Design a protein around this ligand. Structure first.
Ligand SMILES: [Zn+2]
Ligand SMILES: [Zn+2]
Lengths: 298, 230, 64, 248, 209, 82, 99
RNA sequence: AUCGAGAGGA
């Protein structure tokens, strides 16, 4: 659930949606290529000399440290703009993840193609340590293929790693609408944006800047128990069982659900309706043997 | 699930699988060999030594670079083995008993590749071209599946199934019973030839084996050896 | 696969162990009873049984 | 697909049924009215949270939850100042008493203030404003029964003094006991165990609705109080009830 | 970036003041409701510039019932706090004669520091919180009912009223998020007040284990 | 436990009624004296129900409490709800 | 839910050449930091923001024995390798690849 | 009589 104007303006709800949903570089990359591009002054890719020269015709980094192997990634406009993501941020994330060991340069947004250029920067001392130039693993092109495989899937640009998808909608049903008491004292239902997720990360989401921390909740009871504790999971377990039982319009008297949820929670931890719960109580061995594990219990 | 056209042996199953720089490597689960073999080693053991000659069995149009990129990790993996004798040794090191001499390991590998791998394609010598083409077709089918160009097979589709009727069901029993009868005829006669004298075969043939094997299995419906009823 | 082998010289069963020195692309098989040792080049495909087979082959090659 | 589901669903559901019974089979209402397991640990201090059996309760509506502040005041605040409305609702000696006796007027005002406080408590318990609740004694049907047993003419003024309503409902609340004892723990737990029923009782059986809407006579109200007491006591859970096996 | 860190520090401070107030330490209304721009005014807007330093954020509060019962809140600068930093806080607590402190850590705490919190526990009670678990006050969440720590006298009255042993009460783990919030130790009891759809209100009691 | 403050409910439970009627019927079938006038009714369980409604059954119910104490209540002390 | 490419503005701080910059960066310029409105000679259009930016430019302008076996462990390619070949990294990668 | 298997009922 969202606070403030982000609960009414769809664009702000979408902004929070982008702040939650996990986006890796693969979700925003159209293609990748590896080139032998040994002189940035005369790039073997023709379509980009006009910007590449502008980076090298200034002193901030030294072509003598440049590895001749180029990693070239092409992004696509729709996935970038659906996320309000910029190549300045992508480069910042790259340099945050790899430091100064990896050099990245990128083009103007005026282009019909979004491109950034990556290569290993060899700021070593030029020792004659020439036995394969490294003591065992790889040459630079195979290494750069490994760097690509890593960057595509293990570099996070936005969101929370476990939140695989987010949906936003207006709730048609009053059980998800915000209810207020008016100054006249009537109940009123407000239709406000909510986000539903695939995947769970309750503690991170509660701490987001416009998330309503009072109402936001998981359906995973072990997450509730970890973040909010035993009385929270006592209330959530009742809610979830009620939802399952009442989905078809059936009704069960509250005291039965209450007694099951209390049985599941009176020991201070989530006790499963399974041998791993029931047969770990202080109940005597003859009671345990009537359920499961009969001979091992005895 | 390969079966020879005449049921001289039961079916033998070959699996060619694609494993879940990192790349998609293809391996073969051959029968009587303890470990999965890189397919390119299986092709070299069948005597196709150069990478081009191998890919000519797997990729029928070379102007299709998406398949080439997908076989390439397997050409990389096997590049350390480059001669047929090294490949047959590699295969024979596995499955064969560790101590046997090089000639016996090579011979074991050739025996598996002739008689146990794809027996429906042939069990003769000089069948290696037929076997290389069918194993190449198996890899090609796997590539088409991995590229999404051909749909995965349905185990429910009744074209992929067969109904064993009374005849085949009885033939399954009678093979094993006739084998047990020949076994007992050898066991009976050997303790006469060990005693230097000819034997009456009318006494060697214990006709109870067939008569009671078929009777028992039809009586109980346990379709197998009575000793193995569970 | 089996990773312990009968020594070709001293006939003790499960007396030979293989050390796969991957970093130097070399494999050493050593018998604990007689301390006969053999070294062979190994690949990443190579396994203890390939080293043992190389040793048995080198022994039969020396008998010629 | 329906034949498959009919054959396949049954093992999983029956296993769930077994595991539930085996988890709860010894959970019982004790003679102290706590709910405890075989190791005698407290699971609930009162069954449900209210001490009542499930078979003796029914759906009712909380009349004070949903109304606006103006409609709440209009329906529930007794107007002791409009002489003609009293004259149409109460007999003459009652109108004379209600118009003049400042003590009675103060009792009626703090009756309304107790309803206002109860309304604010309900607004916290039911923040989604669903008035539908499950409670033991069906007050409206008992009032309709009193109306028919005593031949109440709705079109005549009643002999029932509104102060007898205020006092009678105060005295009835003291007889509907779920937690016994004079100590402040018992007294608080008693107040909690019966809070929602007492809110429903006070709002249904208030002096203004008894005057304007239900028009009960004194003998019919005296009958209604005894009916409510008897039906509440019959709703309390019996010690020895195997409530765990029942819940499973 | 500094606009994010200053917001985090402000939220964490607000939660810590709420926690201290709920534990019964004397906390002013002004610091309990301090706004983000007032935090920026008092402490600064560029913690990367060292303005504030997280050493500036330190809190000291005294109990409402005894002005000599005092508690620190420490916000270590290093992300993963080791035994050297615990020893520094132990020294400061020894010289100021303060027995309770909360240590709020950014990424975690070393095994040696964790054990050092156990091994001094009778004389100096040190508690660990991650900053992440202080970015929201969990007691404001709608699933969490009101928790009230009981006095020893009230527990004696409870056990005498219902004629029961402590081991017959339902339990709460000392590591429960709300038990950690209130700082309750083994053998304390927490009263829980929750609304009920059938009684109206229900109170339950949990023994800390 | 002191008898001057019994705290269990003054109503007879459904389980108490069931077992009291069974026990008393078995006593009447074993020729225990009957505490009521009989309109010629001969069924031990009907006689037991007459004695129950008359409040004449000579049986004490010992209600055990969870703490191991008990209260003794006579069947004539309890309110019979059926 | 909408999208557009409004990038009509330019980074207009000076190059080392003294020519003004012409790069259409959105919000951060690698050579110049956070973008701000600037005049026809690249001076910020803010008497205070041009002071904070000048102080940030000042902060940027202000900022025997045998072969030790650790000396091979600090090279850039080993630093990248320890990340990219980490067992957890390769597992998280192949976990995303299998999905 | 036991054990196992198979076919059925709700
Ligand atoms: Zn040896
Ligand atoms: Zn610029």
């Amino acid at each position: 659930f969202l606070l403030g104007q982000s609960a009414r303006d769809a664009e702000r709800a979408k902004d929070i949606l982008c702040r939650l949903e996990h986006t890796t570089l693969r979700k925003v990359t159209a293609n990748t290529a590896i080139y032998y591009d040994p002189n940035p002054q005369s790039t073997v890719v023709a379509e980009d000399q006009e910007w590449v020269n502008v980076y090298y015709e200034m002193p901030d980094f030294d072509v003598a440290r440049i590895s001749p192997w180029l990693l070239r990634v092409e992004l696509d406009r729709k996935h970038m703009t659906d996320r309000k993501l910029t190549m300045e941020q992508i480069a910042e994330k790259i340099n945050a993840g790899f430091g100064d060991d990896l050099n990245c340069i990128f083009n103007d947004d005026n282009a019909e193609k979004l491109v950034l250029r990556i290569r290993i920067m060899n700021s070593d001392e030029n020792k004659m340590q020439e036995e394969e130039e490294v003591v065992d693993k790889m040459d630079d092109d195979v290494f750069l293929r490994c760097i690509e495989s890593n960057m595509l899937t293990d570099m996070t640009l936005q969101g929370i790693e476990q939140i695989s998808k987010v949906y936003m909608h207006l709730p048609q049903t009053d059980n998800k609408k915000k209810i207020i008491i008016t100054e006249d004292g009537e109940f009123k239902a407000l239709q406000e944006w909510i986000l539903e997720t695939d995947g769970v990360s309750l503690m991170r989401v509660l701490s987001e800047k416009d998330v309503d921390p009072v109402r936001t909740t998981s359906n995973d009871i072990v997450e509730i128990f970890t973040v909010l504790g035993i009385e929270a999971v006592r209330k959530a377990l009742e809610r979830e069982l009620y939802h399952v039982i009442s989905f078809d319009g059936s009704y069960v008297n509250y005291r039965h659900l209450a007694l099951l949820c209390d049985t599941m929670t009176c020991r201070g931890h989530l006790m499963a309706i399974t041998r791993h719960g029931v047969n770990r109580q202080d109940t005597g061995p003859l009671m345990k043997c009537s359920f499961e594990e009969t001979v091992d219990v005895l | 699930r390969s079966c020879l056209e005449n049921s001289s042996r039961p079916t033998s199953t070959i699996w060619v699988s694609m494993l879940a720089a990192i790349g998609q490597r293809i391996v073969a689960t051959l029968p009587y060999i303890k470990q999965e073999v890189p397919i390119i080693i299986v092709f070299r053991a069948l005597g196709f030594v150069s990478d081009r000659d191998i890919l000519e069995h797997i990729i029928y149009d070379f102007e299709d670079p998406e398949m080439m990129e997908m076989v390439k990790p397997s050409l990389d993996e096997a590049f350390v083995i480059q001669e047929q004798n090294v490949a047959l040794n590699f295969i024979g090191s596995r499955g064969a008993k560790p101590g046997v001499t090089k000639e016996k390991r090579i011979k074991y590998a050739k025996e598996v590749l002739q008689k146990e791998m794809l027996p429906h394609v042939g069990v003769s010598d000089f069948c290696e071209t037929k076997k290389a083409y069918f194993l190449g077709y198996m890899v090609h089918r796997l590539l088409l599946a991995a590229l999404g160009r051909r749909e995965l097979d349905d185990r429910d589709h009744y074209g992929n199934k067969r109904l064993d009727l009374a005849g085949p069901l009885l033939a399954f029993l009678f093979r094993g019973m006739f084998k047990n009868l020949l076994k007992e005829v050898r066991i009976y006669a050997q303790k006469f030839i060990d005693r230097g004298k000819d034997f009456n075969l009318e006494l060697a043939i214990k006709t109870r084996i067939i008569s009671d094997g078929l009777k028992y299995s039809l009586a109980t419906g346990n379709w197998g050896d009575q000793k193995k009823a569970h | 696969l089996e990773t312990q082998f009968t020594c070709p010289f001293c006939n003790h069963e499960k007396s030979c162990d293989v050390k796969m020195d991957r970093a130097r692309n070399t494999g050493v098989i050593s018998c604990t009873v007689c301390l006969e040792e053999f070294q062979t080049p190994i690949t990443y495909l190579s396994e203890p049984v390939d080293v043992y087979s190389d040793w048995i082959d080198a022994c039969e090659a020396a008998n010629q | 697909e329906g034949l498959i589901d009919t054959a396949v669903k049954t093992a999983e559901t029956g296993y769930i049924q077994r595991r539930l019974i085996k988890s709860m089979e010894s959970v019982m209402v004790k003679y102290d009215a706590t709910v405890r397991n075989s190791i005698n640990q407290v699971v609930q201090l009162r069954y449900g949270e209210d001490g009542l059996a499930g078979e003796s309760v029914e759906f009712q509506n909380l009349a004070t939850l949903k109304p606006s502040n103006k409609a709440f005041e209009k329906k529930f605040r007794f107007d002791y100042t409009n002489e003609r409305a009293l004259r149409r609702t109460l007999q003459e000696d009652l109108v004379k008493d209600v118009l003049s006796n400042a003590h009675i007027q103060n009792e009626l005002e703090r009756e309304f203030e107790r309803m206002r406080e109860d309304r604010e408590v309900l607004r916290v318990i039911f923040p989604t404003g669903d008035s539908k609740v499950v409670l033991p004694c069906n007050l409206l049907r008992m009032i309709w029964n009193a109306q028919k047993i005593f031949h109440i003419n709705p079109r005549l003024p009643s002999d029932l003094h509104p102060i007898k309503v205020v006092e009678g409902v105060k005295e009835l609340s003291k007889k509907l006991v779920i937690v016994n004892g004079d100590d402040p723990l018992s007294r608080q737990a008693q107040e909690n165990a019966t809070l929602l029923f007492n809110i429903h009782l006070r709002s249904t059986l208030c002096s203004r609705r008894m005057a304007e809407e239900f028009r009960l006579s004194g003998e019919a109200f005296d009958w209604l109080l005894g009916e409510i007491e008897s039906k509440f006591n019959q709703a309390i859970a019996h010690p020895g009830e195997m409530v765990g096996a029942l819940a499973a | 970036d500094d606009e994010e860190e200053t917001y985090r520090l402000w939220k964490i401070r607000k939660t810590i003041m709420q926690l201290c107030h709920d534990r019964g330490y004397l906390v002013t209304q002004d610091e309990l409701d301090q706004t983000l721009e007032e935090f920026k005014a008092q402490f600064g807007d560029k913690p990367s510039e060292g303005r504030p330093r997280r050493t500036d954020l330190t809190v000291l509060v005294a109990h409402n019932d005894d002005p000599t019962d005092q508690m620190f809140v420490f916000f270590p600068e290093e992300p993963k706090v080791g035994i050297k930093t615990i020893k520094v806080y132990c020294q400061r607590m020894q010289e100021e004669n303060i027995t309770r402190a909360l240590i709020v850590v950014q990424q975690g705490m070393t095994p040696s520091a964790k054990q050092s919190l156990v091994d001094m526990a009778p004389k100096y009670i040190l508690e660990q919180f991650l900053q992440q678990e202080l970015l929201i006050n969990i007691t404001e969440h709608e699933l969490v009912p009101e928790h009230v720590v009981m006095t020893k006298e009230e527990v004696t009255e409870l056990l005498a009223r219902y004629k029961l042993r402590e081991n017959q009460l339902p339990r709460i783990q000392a590591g429960d998020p709300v038990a950690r919030y209130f700082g309750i130790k083994r053998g304390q009891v927490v009263k829980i007040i929750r609304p009920s759809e059938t009684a109206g209100r229900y109170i339950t009691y949990r023994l800390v284990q | 436990q002191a008898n001057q403050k019994r705290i269990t409910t003054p109503y007879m439970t459904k389980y108490e009624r069931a077992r009291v009627l069974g026990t008393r019927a078995l006593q009447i079938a074993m020729c225990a004296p009957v505490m009521v006038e009989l309109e010629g009714e001969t069924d031990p369980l009907l006689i037991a129900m007459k004695e129950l409604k008359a409040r004449k059954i000579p049986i004490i119910i010992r209600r055990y409490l969870p703490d191991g104490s008990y209260e003794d209540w006579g069947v004539d002390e309890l309110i019979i709800s059926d | 839910a909408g999208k557009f490419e409004p990038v009509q503005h330019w980074c207009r701080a000076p190059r080392p050449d003294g020519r003004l910059c012409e790069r259409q960066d959105r919000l951060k310029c690698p050579f110049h930091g956070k973008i701000v409105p600037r005049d026809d000679e690249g001076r910020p259009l803010d008497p205070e923001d041009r002071a904070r930016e000048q102080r940030r430019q000042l902060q940027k302008q202000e900022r025997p024995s045998l072969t030790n076996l650790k000396a091979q462990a600090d090279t850039a390619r080993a630093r990248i390798g320890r990340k990219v070949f980490a067992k957890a990294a390769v597992r998280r990668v192949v976990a995303a690849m299998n999905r």
